[PDB]
Amino acid sequence: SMEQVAMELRLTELTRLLRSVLDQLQDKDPARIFAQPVSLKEVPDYLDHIKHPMDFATMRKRLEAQGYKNLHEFEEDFDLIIDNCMKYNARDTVFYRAAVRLRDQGGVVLRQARREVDSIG
Numbered sequence: 846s847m848e849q850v851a852m853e854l855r856l857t858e859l860t861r862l863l864r865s866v867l868d869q870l871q872d873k874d875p876a877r878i879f880a881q882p883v884s885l886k887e888v889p890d891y892l893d894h895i896k897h898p899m900d901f902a903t904m905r906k907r908l909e910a911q912g913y914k915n916l917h918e919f920e921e922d923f924d925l926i927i928d929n930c931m932k933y934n935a936r937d938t939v940f941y942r943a944a945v946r947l948r949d950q951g952g953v954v955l956r957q958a959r960r961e962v963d964s965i966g
Contacts, residue, residue, distance in 0.1 A: 897929070
């Protein structure tokens, strides 16, 4: 139907905006701490601690299958990256501190993305 096509054009445009948002978020992680999944070879107990792992590569695979229906879903996954790290790692670590910085800096980007998703519809 033409209605289905139009919904698909909206999904595609959301996907384009989310890709730019994701690049901007990942620049706030110049150390690449959050680039890839936590390795189960190197942290074999990780899944006893963290139930829903997340990382930027995993987000990127989802995005390119147009798997985010809205910004809420995308923010949930970004929040998991930060929140998993701040539970698994202690306050006095390079990992926890990188999370806090990504959160603070990413909040700016997300504040305007929420306005752009609303605005462009």
